[PDB]
A paper describes a structure:
Receptor binding involves the N‐terminal portion including the [name] and N‐terminal domains (Cordle et al, 2008; Luca et al, 2015, 2017).
To determine whether the Drosophila ligands adopt the same arrangement as their mammalian counterparts, we solved the structures of the N‐terminal region of Drosophila Delta and Serrate as well as the ligand‐binding region of Drosophila Notch (EGF11‐13; Fig EV1A–E). Notable exceptions to the overall conserved arrangements are the β1‐2 and β5‐6 loops which exhibit different lengths and folding in the ligands. Disulphide bonds are shown as yellow sticks and the bound calcium ion in the Serrate structure as a grey sphere. The β1‐2 loop (blue for Delta, at top) adopts a different conformation in Delta than in Serrate despite conservation of the two stabilizing disulphides; (E) Notch—one copy of EGF11‐13. Likewise, the equivalent fragment containing SerrateΔβ1‐2 loop deletion (removal of residues LRATK) also exhibited reduced binding to liposomes, although to a variable extent that was not reproducibly significant. Combining [name]Δβ1‐2 allele with this double‐mutant chromosome enhanced the thickening of veins in a similar manner to DlΔβ1‐2.
Numbering used by the authors: 80 to 349
Write the structure that this text describes.
């Protein structure tokens, strides 16, 4: 999941015309003003996003906008450069996996409403088909049309906690008892130094720490299980009172040396 983002950067429509060659706003004949020339446009932008299209008919908004459609607020007059493109950005959410391939249709529209909608109010129209991967980097596009020049930019970003080219790999970094890991560029758990395991919840103990009789709750340490000792927890403790004997790799035992017997190995056998 994530969003396809489009930010208008500039439109240049110096003569305040429509694509059909007429003026924006009210026809000058119907105006009761001293204004000379065309009235200014009231420009907004409509984005139609859809699957990658292999023919000219696909570059129309008549084939539908499966990936979403939106219209900005009025962003300015006939020509303007947006100092802060983010405020009027078009954000189209997508669910499941990002498609990578797409076709967009971007229209500039004169929002002068008299009989309410009409297609004569198209100022300019452009289309772009391509393949884009999730990234905060913008792709800048520039359309020098017959009537207006539109500069805009697009990007795709995964929803928060999602990664990978598909925006479906989940990762949330953790630094507590249940895990110690950062998130990689594709959502991989990157264990913090000294940790391992499925959730990077296992401390990596001191080098040489006995894997069976040693443990650690913090990296680089070696704590001994009952009846074992030494810096590496590899030395068993003999049963208290054991004389001529050893633990033989088992905690609290007294296994006799040759020619000694008894529970404490203190009986000379010969
Ligand atoms: C990023 O997306 C790709 C696309 O699926 C993942 O790579 C594929 O899937 C397996 C995982 O089971 C990878 O080991 C292979 O290298 C890829 N196989 C094919 C046929 O493309 C990749 O795993 C994703 N990254 C993460 C962290 O999930
Ligand atoms: Ca023009």
């Amino acid at each position: 999941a994530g969003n396809f983002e489009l930010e208008i950067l500039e439109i240049s429509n110096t003569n305040s015309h429509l694509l059909n060659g007429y003026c924006c706003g009210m026809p000058a004949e119907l105006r009761a003003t001293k204004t000379i020339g065309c009235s200014p446009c009231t420009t907004a932008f409509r984005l139609c996003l859809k699957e990658y299209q292999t023919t000219e008919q696909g570059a129309s908004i008549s084939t539908g906008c499966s990936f979403g459609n939106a219209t900005t607020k009025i962003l300015g007059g006939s020509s303007f450069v947006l100092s802060d493109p983010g405020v009027g950005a078009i954000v189209l959410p997508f669910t499941f996996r990002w498609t990578k391939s797409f076709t967009l249709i971007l229209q500039a529209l004169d929002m002068y409403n008299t009989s309410y909608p009409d297609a004569e109010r198209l100022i300019e129209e452009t289309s772009y088909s391509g393949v884009i991967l999730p990234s905060p980097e913008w792709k800048t596009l520039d359309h020098i049309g017959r009537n207006a020049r539109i500069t805009y930019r697009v990007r795709v970003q995964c929803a928060v906690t999602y990664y990978n080219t598909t925006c479906t790999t989940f990762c949330r970094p953790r630094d507590d008892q249940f895990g110690h890991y950062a998130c990689g560029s594709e959502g991989q758990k990157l264990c913090l130094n000294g940790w391992q395991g499925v959730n990077c919840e296992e401390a990596i103990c001191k080098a040489g720490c006995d894997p069976v009789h040693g443990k650690c709750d913090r990296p680089g340490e070696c704590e001994c299980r009952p009846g074992w000792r030494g810096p590496l927890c590899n030395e068993c403790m003999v049963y208290p009172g054991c004389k001529h004997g050893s633990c033989n790799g088992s905690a609290w035992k007294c296994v006799c040396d040759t020619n000694w017997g008894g529970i404490l190995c203190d009986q000379d056998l010969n």
